[PDB]
């Protein structure tokens, strides 16, 4: 149960939050998990996804083991267009199909300055929370 009284547990207010969310929050919403190998490395459960990340789709029609590269993110529809997931429209032009980020797993991070910075912050809060809970 939630005991904090200023947080709301009401259906229409949360749906309103999502469908009318700003870009900077959407960034935070559209997150995906790390594989257990990478989880062994950084000791981190999940990360916000980036434009140039490699991914495996788990469910849907296009599922498999094909590590596809990301092409572009469409936050306004909360969805991403990936390298080989597409279908040909009649005239011939192919179209990348949108996929929801949660149905996706990272195999290789595009590692910038901030990305390493964030992973260390998350690791710090993990070490403190486990030793503190301990």
């Amino acid at each position: 149960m939630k005991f904090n009284p200023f947080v709301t547990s009401d259906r229409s207010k949360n749906r309103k939050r999502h469908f009318n969310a700003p870009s900077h929050i959407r960034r935070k919403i559209m997150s995906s998990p790390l594989s257990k190998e990478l989880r062994q490395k950084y000791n981190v459960r999940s990360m916000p996804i980036r434009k140039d990340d490699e991914v495996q789709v788990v469910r849907g029609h296009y599922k498999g083991q094909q590590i596809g590269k990301v092409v572009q993110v469409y936050r306004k529809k909360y969805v991403i267009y990936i390298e080989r997931v597409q279908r040909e429209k009649a005239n011939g032009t192919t179209v990348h199909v949108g996929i929801h980020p949660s149905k996706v797993v990272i195999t290789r991070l595009k590692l910038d300055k901030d990305r390493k910075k964030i992973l260390e912050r998350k690791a710090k809060s993990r070490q403190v929370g486990k030793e503190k809970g301990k």
Partner: protein, 270 residues
């Protein structure tokens, strides 16, 4: 709101014109002209007896009756048939007014409290609740009353030593202070037989809180236990005592059905 409906101006056309003699909207080339404002039957319009806030919501009740109730309910918790008929699954449980050692208070984690309920073999009721977690029917759905589940077994404690935090995660289980007991929870639906789990302190305190029949309660100012009207409920055993049977008449239990009238003029042997 009281305003609802009546904000329009609407003079009636009146007699003539072969029309209904109703409050009609005042002019203008648009749909709403002659279109009907007030009246429960008109579109829009004031529903009958606008719902007022100064309705009598709250019903007060007498103290003696409340305490009577808590007593009856507790008496029922000792009876097993009643506990079963409320559906609680309790066959291998050793004793219904199920008392426990006072070390549980010192528990602070659910893994332990669960393993405890396993040792007491009360988990099947929770198992029933888990299987029974499902969706509500109707418009409630859109007003945050979506999910429903069966009620579980009560746990009563005297003093909080972390146990509250420790149990609250298990679905169904209501905790209770003993001093501050509640009926709305003890007898849901006014139906008798919630399965309870007492602690030794709470079990001993009842003798002081309500008293026996020859010692009043020390805590409440003036309150003895509720009196019986008749003690020997089992009339089956009564009715076959020597004394009454001795003093009764003989049961005339032979059935004498309706006789058919045969004609004496015709039938000789009749």
């Amino acid at each position: 709101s009281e305003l609802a409906g009546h904000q329009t101006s609407a003079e009636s056309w009146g007699t003539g014109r072969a029309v209904a003699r109703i409050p009609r909207v005042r002019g203008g080339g648009t749909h709403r002209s002659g279109q009907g404002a007030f009246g429960n039957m008109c579109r829009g319009g004031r529903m009958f007896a606008p719902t007022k806030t100064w309705r009598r919501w709250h019903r007060r009740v007498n103290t003696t009756q409340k305490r009577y109730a808590i007593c009856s309910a507790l008496a029922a918790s000792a009876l097993p048939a009643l506990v079963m008929s409320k559906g609680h699954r309790i066959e291998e449980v050793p004793e219904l007014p199920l008392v426990v050692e006072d070390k549980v208070e010192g528990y602070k984690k659910t893994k332990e409290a669960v393993l405890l309920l396993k040792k007491l073999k009360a988990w099947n009721d929770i198992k029933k609740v888990y299987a029974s977690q499902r969706m509500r029917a109707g418009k409630g759905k859109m007003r945050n009353r979506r999910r429903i589940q069966r009620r579980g077994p009560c746990v009563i404690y005297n003093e909080d030593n972390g146990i509250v935090k420790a149990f609250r995660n298990i679905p169904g289980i209501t905790l209770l202070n003993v001093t501050k007991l509640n009926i709305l929870k003890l007898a849901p639906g006014g139906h008798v037989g919630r399965f309870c789990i007492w602690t030794e302190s709470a079990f001993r305190k009842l003798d002081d809180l309500y008293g026996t029949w020859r010692k009043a309660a020390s805590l409440k100012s003036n309150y003895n236990l509720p009196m019986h009207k008749m003690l020997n409920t089992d009339l089956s055993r009564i009715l076959k005592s020597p004394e009454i049977q001795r003093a009764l008449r003989a049961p005339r239990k032979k059935i004498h059905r309706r006789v058919l009238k045969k004609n004496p003029l015709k039938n000789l042997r009749i």
